[PDB]
């Protein structure tokens, strides 16, 4: 990762998985440059430019044989990123030197590489998000019936289930999964367009034949594995593309942050905890992996303003005031999302529920929500008011003298509630207060979640 | 008055900027009508599932949907400090009263109203957006072959065409149209969910009947005009929907700002101007005032995206009420702003002024510096020499540059070539070698293909 | 009119005084006010302006015809020239001398600076009054022990007043910031179309000193200590960044406080004056305040040269909204701070249910002094903790670590004063003393200039 | 290598962009040095306060600040899960004599949180002279070009003439406000000191046997040694996260200014009026350095939402959900800012001005702005106002058509000069269109601004 004598990005050197790091590495970047020049030359041969099979063979064998030292020093001399690599690749491919980058300009390698990078980055996030959704869905099913105190205003609300509450987190990740897939499939190749998008150099190279330029653009698009290319660009693809991508990651950021806020709140209530590793026979447990996910999700929300501002200040066919900003924020958003999903998969595998803790809290709150079922079970005016005064004193005891709720007791002795004694244990059954929470979990998993997850069954 | 008094603050978004249609969809009249419209649909679905509601009770609601007493509603809200219940009383006062809102909570009306408002607001933006695109398309077709100086780094570069440049704007607006359409299509109804989304109150109402509660959830969803309803909600629909909606407006703001920034730059170059207003010739100096307003307003949209993002991130459990005030402001203001922008942008597109002679004058100044490759190629074809020509053209290029920079004169490079003996085997070809049209690449063909494949197919559903 | 949209901030949220500051009555009245000051200064410096013309203007500052002015703008397509003419119509004798030598931003930008300053002046007392009522609560509850929270997890005891000082300290930092931006706000003055004072220079036929003088006079009349030396058409949009930055910071502070109050309401240790609806309202609007900061940031980044008019419509929206939003928050925070209710028994319970686990060191250092070993006590205390933790977590019961230590024969010398070893006040450190010190050295001096009168 | 292998992502801020000094400030070698330097200060102060620390232990501690075993600490961190105790052990290992008195009575954030504040302040100290240095270069330029008339620009349309030096003062003023805000925030930065787990100083009070006086003066001593004038009286576990908001707010604002300057330079580059420095070894020159600054400034403006959101959701005495966000955003903000200023210093050094392209654009626009001047000269010679205004009006329409509908030069002056009606002012015409008389007070505004504001603001930094 490098020396401690200098600053190191905590995302690469500490947080993110090596795979995502490699996608944004200089090796991947410059390999892809060489790959693009190969596809270019191959297509140009087919279209009748003087390129031999020996020159193609030379380029194919030397895609990974990159001299970084020599390339960086040639940049210093030629003050050009692309020209330096054209020359370097030429030195290790002496037969091909005269045909590399023929007709093209800088953005053929620069911009198309970012597109290939963008796509590859989404492709690694997809199964990670799919794997989180699946494990939460496992958990959702097991705890689909378990009654838990609902919360609105973070206050005692009617009963829900742990499996129901989990399905709220799952659905947000599902909207995100659908969004990531939609953006990945819509990405288009820039292809060959020239300095200003007019294909003027390539038109001159193919001595004025429009049809040949059209074919060239089709051929590299397909070699690159892209279904579609832009008809219209300036020098580069429209920077709107980066907004579309980072908007969805920002949206994922906000969903994750919400999931982790919930878990941190439940971990205070002792109702649920993060998984442990290295475990066996501490009381105090910090939800550190959830606090980490929040911290990083935040940064993922912040980054969306960068591509927005960039897109707004692009003058005409392009200005280079996007270049540096894009080298930073694109990498960060993906490495940030990658980390979040790796850490979120850990949290989701074995979430620890504490049933008796959840049952205790419910018992403290249920007699204040069961009052209506007591009245509609007596066969109204003197039963709405005579139970109310008992609630007055029981609510006065809980707040003014912090402790247990004894409303059950106050009814269990009063003469007025004579017949309703025989049916109190059934009237205070927690599951009868949970509504369709169980039915809803089931139907959600079968109609929405399972159809979505199936294309990912190979890797779990 | 018909809006507000001068002695109080009035948002200029409502008073000075947006159209009456978009302003209506966010008004309290439309909001409280929609509340009554939801209560009506519920009662209809409730009766059709065998609940004790009379066909007379229904028609008293069906007739009194518009009849809203605004002073009584505000006083019962002064009494109970609860807006939904206050409107329940007021509707029952003019009606029936005992069957209003039965089994439902506040968010049956306060949350399904938002989704109807969002859907209708998107309905207002769509045809306005297609209209702009349509106008620019015609401008792009008309100007498809008019050579213009290309700009990278905002320095002169390979020529393009006005039509081609306009397609860059069109493309961005077409992606916005597609995103607005998708997000409107993907919008789902909350339906009947109860206080925490468990539907407990409606299960009680239908006496434990699971199938019946779901039958109600389907009935009110179709009545509201939605293809699909959420299975999973807390008290409200997920605040993620607000993010998808304002994300696409934010992106649209980005597009517009860029389009309008280009226009202001073109205006300075005097190559393009905004349409003429009337008088009773036109003035020499003209500020791109309408473009600057669009830029100003677009900026607001890009900013608003952070509101729904932060909101969604800190929603604890089934629901917290720290979304309420923030949503009252940012939802309406996003749409009101977008609406203003589209109205203004359409106005700009109707008769953009082009000045062909100014475009030509800038081209004649810059082109010779970009055309030396074509001069060398033409020499070699008639017995010339590459390195001899380069060095005997690099020197005249540096002389011409000096007059333009150090002296601030007109570019004389062509004139320096038109007399120089070394370039005698080329003099009959100089004007043809500097034909702007032969420098525009495939620009005009790109316009034609793009319009035929990607613009008219999208505009087809909006012909009227 | 319910048949049209109304800004919730404007209608049914913010104070009538703040709404008035951003009203058009106040705006156009200030325009007229600034024209009079310009006329007054110009007479002094020797232009043909008569006292009659000046009295005509001083009488008609509030006499504004919004119908006429609005109709004349449609015809002239100029907001300032529309109001020059309207003012000239109700002051026929003044007509020719209004706005003499001036440009549009003389009224446009100096009005926005007058508005900003006056809007800050309304924010300062309200904030001070909030800080003052939290300081009383802080003093009242300085000694009351409460459970400290790190990671939202039980942590070393603090006091209620000490926790309140965390909130106070954030608000005080905002108070100093609002005051520093207010006091160091500068006047645009008279600058001309591009900032070069060219027309004023020609109006006084070349007299440089007369232009400086005119600039000084209007600046003093408007109640500012300094004018900008350098401007384009307008004052730098960096000023709007600095103002909205401090309000955004205040937003973040407020949001933190109201989130803390919302969690305590869940813990039933504290309640709002009679669902923490007001704190949710506060959080929701604090959030919108934080959002706004990107507007002037984006604006100032893309101003080309002496002025571009892409700031105009965005400023009309973000400026007023930030102050109306700020205002609303402070009015609501004042109502929360007026009736905060702590429930001491609920707090006492939670402590007793969590203190035993944190008190493990004090029992050891009472045992080691009694003869026992640090090895032979840490081992025995851990097995009894393992037993207590099961009852709480696996059985959802009461923390009986206090009971279990009384039945174990090992801790026999320790029995005599377990009341003292688990006395919550001994676990609070310097909390109360930290409160008294902070209030007297930092808070009270800051509130000293206010509270008057 | 040391700047990372090409097989992994390497931040372009640390490797490619920022200066070495700023990179070292956020390096782990600086972080762990300071951690250890803070333990020394803690030990020295405690010994003075009567605790059992030997001067043998102080000297052993003082010698082993530089030599850090990173391999040991990382593996100890794996074994412990505590980053501080990992370095408490690794320090206690190489300093065996003083193993019992390292981190005595202290909490994790004594080193974590105070280090953050020390870095913040050293980073600000690197930025300030760099900012001053830039302002100073532009000042020189703005004095030199103080009387060079140039076309004013409102709406990006021709307007009343300013001077090149006056326009530069517009840029300088934004950077001077940035300088003022940076210094203030640097000086108003408070030390976290010794506060314990939740800010109550409980463990320190315990070790000083209930003595408040000794707690308070330990806080003051270590603050003094760290170089701070003032400590917080009130903290949770850490210093309030409102501090990070103040710091990144002023950087975002600097970013905003730098973006405006560089946008202006980019536009002037197109107009061929002004260019970025040569440093040669052509005709078309892209302003690549101004574009770099703009790109980097934009990111700086974006970062402000990090600390804002962070502060807004800090529950009670502290939550760890700020940790990861702060490591990225703070470091990145100072790396970017430093890079921007480095590039800005380079731009200021040898900015190229083209006086004859400036003169050309004036001659094209000025005649339209000089109409009232001409009518006044005509009336002064006993002429008719209404006839003169109508003549100018018609000649102005003809000349505008040539410019817009024919793409010609402005020929308004030549039309006036060949018209016999204008005979009374024909001799006055060169003088009437002297651009210098159209600049207002621009040349004096520069001198006043530089004397009264700039140089007094620069004096501490010379």
Cβ–Cβ gap D6/A12 under 8 Å: no
Which token pair is A388?
A: 């109310």
Cα atoms found within 13 Å of the Cα of residue C114, Cβ hemisphere only = 24
User: Any bridge partners for residue C420, and if so which?
Assistant: none
Q: In what helix (H) or strand (E) does residue B273 lie, and over which residues does it extend?
A: strand B272-273
CB C310 within 8 A of CB C367: no
Which token pair is C43?
A: 């007479």
- Domain shared by B68 and B130, yes or no: no
- Domain shared by B392 and B460, yes or no: no
Q: How many residues in chain C?
A: 453
User: What single DSSP character describes residue B434?
Assistant: T
CB D297 within 8 A of CB C298: no
Q: Is residue A199 part of a domain?
A: yes
Asked if C308 reaches chain D (Cβ–Cβ under 8 Å), the answer is yes
Which token pair is B36?
A: 């009554």
CB B437 within 8 A of CB A196: no
DSSP track, A109-163: HHHHHHHHHHHHHHHHHHHHHHHHHHHHHHHHHHTSS-EEEEEETTEEEEEEEHH
Handedness of CA D315, D316, D322, D323 (dihedral sign): negative
* Phi then psi dihedrals of residue D226, to 5 deg: -75, -20
Q: Using CB atoms within 10 A of its CB, is residue B390 exposed (0-12), middle (13-18) or buried (19+)? A: middle
Residue C311: C-alpha distances to residues A190, C19, D96, D173 (Å): 35, 22, 65, 19
Q: Which domain holds residue C85?
A: 7-100
Q: Is residue D51 part of a domain?
A: yes
Q: Is residue A186 part of a domain?
A: yes
Q: Which residues contact D100 (CB under 8 A, 6 or more apart)?
A: none
- Domain shared by C66 and C200, yes or no: no
Taking one residue from A and the other from B, the number of pairs with CB-CB distance under 8 angstroms is 250
Nearest to A200 by CA among B445, B139, B357: B445
The whole-angstrom separation of Cα D306 and Cα D326 is: 8
> Strand A352-353 vs strand A272-273: parallel, antiparallel, or unpaired?
antiparallel
Q: In what helix (H) or strand (E) does residue B101 lie, and over which residues does it extend?
A: none
CB A187 within 8 A of CB A118: yes
Residue D79 burial (CB count, 10 A) = 11
- Domain shared by D365 and D396, yes or no: no
Q: b vs e for B346-385, b when ≥16 Cβ sit within 10 Å of the residue's Cβ?
A: bebbeebebbeebbbbbbeebbbbbbbeebbebbeeeebe
Q: Is residue A307 part of a domain?
A: yes
Tokens 């869940």 label which residue? C266
User: What single DSSP character describes residue B319?
Assistant: B
Question: Cβ contacts (< 8 Å) between C227 and chain D: which residues?
Answer: none
Residue A120: C-alpha distances to residues A178, A334, C46 (Å): 17, 11, 75
Q: Is residue C1 part of a domain?
A: no
Cα atoms found within 13 Å of the Cα of residue B227, Cβ hemisphere only = 5
Q: In what helix (H) or strand (E) does residue D158 lie, and over which residues does it extend?
A: strand D157-163
- Domain shared by A59 and A136, yes or no: no
Q: In what helix (H) or strand (E) does residue D151 lie, and over which residues does it extend?
A: strand D149-154
Chain D: give the shortest CA distance to residue C191, in Å: 10
- CATH code of the domain in which D441 resides: 1.20.200.10
- Deposited resolution, Å: 2.6
Cβ–Cβ gap C280/A403 under 8 Å: no
Q: In what helix (H) or strand (E) does residue D422 lie, and over which residues does it extend?
A: none
CB B324 within 8 A of CB C284: yes
User: What single DSSP character describes residue D425?
Assistant: G
Q: b vs e for C97-127, b when ≥16 Cβ sit within 10 Å of the residue's Cβ?
A: bbbbbbbbbbbbbbbbbbbbbbbbebbbebb
- CATH code of the domain in which C405 resides: 6.10.250.1570
Cβ–Cβ gap B295/C280 under 8 Å: no
Residue B207 burial (CB count, 10 A) = 7
Question: Cβ contacts (< 8 Å) between A30 and chain D: which residues?
Answer: 6
The whole-angstrom separation of Cα D41 and Cα D59 is: 12
Chain B: give the shortest CA distance to residue C420, in Å: 40
- CATH code of the domain in which C65 resides: 1.10.275.10
3-state secondary structure chain C: CCCCCCCCCCCCCCCHHHHHHCCHHHHHHHHHHHHHHHHHHHHHCCCCCCHHHHHHHHHCCCCCCHHHHHHHHHHHCCHHHHHHHHHHHHCCCCHHHCCCCCCHHHHHHHHHHHHHHHHHHHHHHHHHHHHHHHHHHHHHCCCCEEEEEECCEEEEEEEHHHHHHHHHHHHHHHHHHHHHHHHCCCECCCCCCCCCCHHHHHHCCCCHHHHHHHHHHHHHHCCCCCECCCCCCCCCCHHHHHHHHHHHHHHHHHHHHHHHHHHHHHHCCEECCCCCHHHHHHHHHHHHHHHHCHHHHHHHHCCCCCECCCCHHHHHHHHHHHHHHHHHHHHHHHHHHHCCEECHHHHHHHHHCCHHHHCHHHHHHHHCCCCCCCHHHHHHHHHHHHHHHHHHHCCCCCCCHHHHHHHCHHHCHHHHHHHHHCCHHHHCCCHHHHHHHHHHHHHHHHHCCCCCC
Q: Which residues contact B194 (CB under 8 A, 6 or more apart)?
A: A158, A435, B104, B105, B200, B201, B202
- Domain shared by A176 and A283, yes or no: yes
- Domain shared by A430 and A443, yes or no: yes
- Domain shared by B204 and B298, yes or no: yes
Which token pair is B327?
A: 């949503």
Domain endpoint, select from A69, A84, A102: A102
Question: Cβ contacts (< 8 Å) between A304 and chain B: which residues?
Answer: 305, 309
Handedness of CA B112, B116, B121, B123 (dihedral sign): positive
Chain D: give the shortest CA distance to residue C148, in Å: 7
Residue A412 burial (CB count, 10 A) = 11
Domain endpoint, select from C82, C100, C118: C100
Tokens 């999700």 label which residue? A297
The whole-angstrom separation of Cα B302 and Cα A306 is: 10
Q: Furthest-apart CA pair in chain A: how many Å?
A: 106
Q: Is residue B6 part of a domain?
A: no
- Domain shared by C122 and C222, yes or no: yes
> Strand A352-353 vs strand B147-152: parallel, antiparallel, or unpaired?
unpaired
The whole-angstrom separation of Cα C219 and Cα C136 is: 41
Q: b vs e for A98-110, b when ≥16 Cβ sit within 10 Å of the residue's Cβ?
A: ebbbbbbbebbbb
Question: Could you tell me how far CA B415 lies from the centroid of its own chain?
Answer: 49
Q: Is residue C359 part of a domain?
A: yes
The whole-angstrom separation of Cα D245 and Cα D252 is: 10
Tokens 């203007």 label which residue? C57
CB A407 within 8 A of CB A367: yes
Tokens 């094209």 label which residue? D364
Q: Using CB atoms within 10 A of its CB, is residue B220 exposed (0-12), middle (13-18) or buried (19+)? A: buried
Q: Is residue A1 part of a domain?
A: no
- Domain shared by C140 and C37, yes or no: no
Nearest to C84 by CA among C42, C26, C49, C39: C39
Residue A115: C-alpha distances to residues A229, D133, D376 (Å): 11, 41, 64
- Domain shared by B119 and B81, yes or no: no
**Residue in D with minimal Cα distance to C171:** D242
Nearest to A320 by CA among B301, D262, D347, D333: D262
Asked if C314 reaches chain A (Cβ–Cβ under 8 Å), the answer is no
The whole-angstrom separation of Cα A249 and Cα A241 is: 13
Residue B287: C-alpha distances to residues B265, B267, B291, C75, C311 (Å): 11, 8, 9, 18, 15
Q: For chain D, percent helix, then strand, then coil, each to nearest 5? A: 70, 5, 25
Domain endpoint, select from B102, B118, B145: B102
CB A167 within 8 A of CB B232: yes
> How many domains does the structure of chain B reveal?
3
User: Any bridge partners for residue C227, and if so which?
Assistant: C187
- Domain shared by A119 and A71, yes or no: no
Q: Which residues contact D328 (CB under 8 A, 6 or more apart)?
A: A9, A10, A11, A299, A332, D306
Asked if A254 reaches chain B (Cβ–Cβ under 8 Å), the answer is yes
Residue numbers of C between 121 and 180 with CB closer than 8 Å to D: 148-152, 155-158, 162-163, 165-166, 168-170, 173
DSSP track, D312-376: HT--TT--STTHHHHHHHHHHHHHHHHHHHHHHHHHHTT-EE-HHHHHHHHHHHHHHHTHHHHHH
Asked if D260 reaches chain C (Cβ–Cβ under 8 Å), the answer is yes
Cα atoms found within 13 Å of the Cα of residue B99, Cβ hemisphere only = 21
- Euclidean distance between the first and the last CA atom of chain A, given in angstroms as a whole number: 30
Residue numbers of D between 200 and 239 with CB closer than 8 Å to C: 200-202, 204-205, 212, 215, 232-234, 236-237
Chain B: give the shortest CA distance to residue C338, in Å: 20
């Amino acid at each position: 990762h490098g020396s401690p004598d200098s600053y190191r990005s905590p995302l690469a050197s500490r947080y993110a998985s090596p795979e995502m790091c490699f996608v944004f590495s200089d090796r991947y970047k410059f390999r892809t440059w060489r790959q693009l020049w190969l596809w270019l030359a191959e297509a140009e041969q087919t279209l009748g430019l003087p390129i031999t099979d020996e020159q193609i063979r030379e380029m194919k064998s030397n895609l990974e044989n990159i001299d970084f030292k020599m390339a960086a020093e040639e940049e210093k001399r030629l003050r050009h990123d692309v020209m330096a690599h054209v020359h370097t690749f030429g030195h290790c491919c002496p037969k091909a030197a005269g045909i590399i980058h023929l007709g093209a300009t800088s953005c053929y390698v620069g911009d198309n590489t970012d597109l290939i990078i963008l796509r590859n980055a989404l492709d690694l996030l997809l199964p990670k998000l799919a794997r989180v959704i699946s494990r939460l869905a496992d958990f959702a099913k097991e705890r689909a019936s378990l009654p838990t105190l609902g919360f609105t205003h973070f206050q005692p609300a009617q009963l829900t289930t742990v499996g129901k509450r989990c399905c709220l987190w799952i659905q947000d990740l599902c909207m995100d999964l659908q969004n990531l897939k939609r953006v990945r499939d819509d990405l288009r190749f820039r292809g060959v367009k020239g300095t200003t998008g007019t294909q003027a150099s390539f038109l001159q190279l193919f001595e004025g034949d429009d049809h040949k330029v059209e074919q060239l653009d089709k051929m590299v698009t397909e070699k690159a594995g892209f279904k579609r290319a832009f008809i219209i660009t300036g020098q580069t693809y429209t920077r709107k593309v980066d907004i579309e991508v980072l908007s969805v990651l920002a949206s994922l950021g906000a969903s994750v942050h919400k999931i982790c806020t919930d878990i941190r709140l439940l971990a205070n209530l002792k109702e649920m905890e993060e998984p442990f590793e290295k475990q066996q026979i501490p009381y105090k447990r910090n939800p550190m992996r959830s606090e980490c996910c929040c911290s990083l999700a935040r940064h993922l929300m912040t980054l969306v303003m960068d591509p927005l501002q960039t897109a707004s200040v692009q003058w005409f066919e392009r200005t280079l005031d996007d270049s540096a900003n894009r080298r930073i924020c694109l990498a960060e958003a993906f490495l940030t999302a990658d980390t979040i999903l790796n850490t979120l998969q850990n949290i989701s595998e074995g979430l620890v529920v504490y049933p008796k803790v959840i049952e205790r809290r419910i018992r403290q709150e249920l007699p204040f929500m069961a009052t209506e079922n007591i009245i509609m079970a007596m066969v109204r005016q003197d039963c709405h008011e005579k139970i109310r005064v008992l609630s007055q004193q029981a609510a006065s005891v809980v707040k003014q003298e912090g402790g247990d709720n004894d409303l059950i007791e106050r009814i269990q002795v009063d003469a007025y509630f004579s017949p309703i004694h025989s049916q109190l244990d059934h009237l205070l059954d927690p599951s009868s207060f949970t509504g369709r929470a169980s039915q809803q979990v089931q139907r959600f998993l079968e109609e929405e979640v399972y159809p979505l997850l199936k294309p990912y069954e190979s890797v779990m």
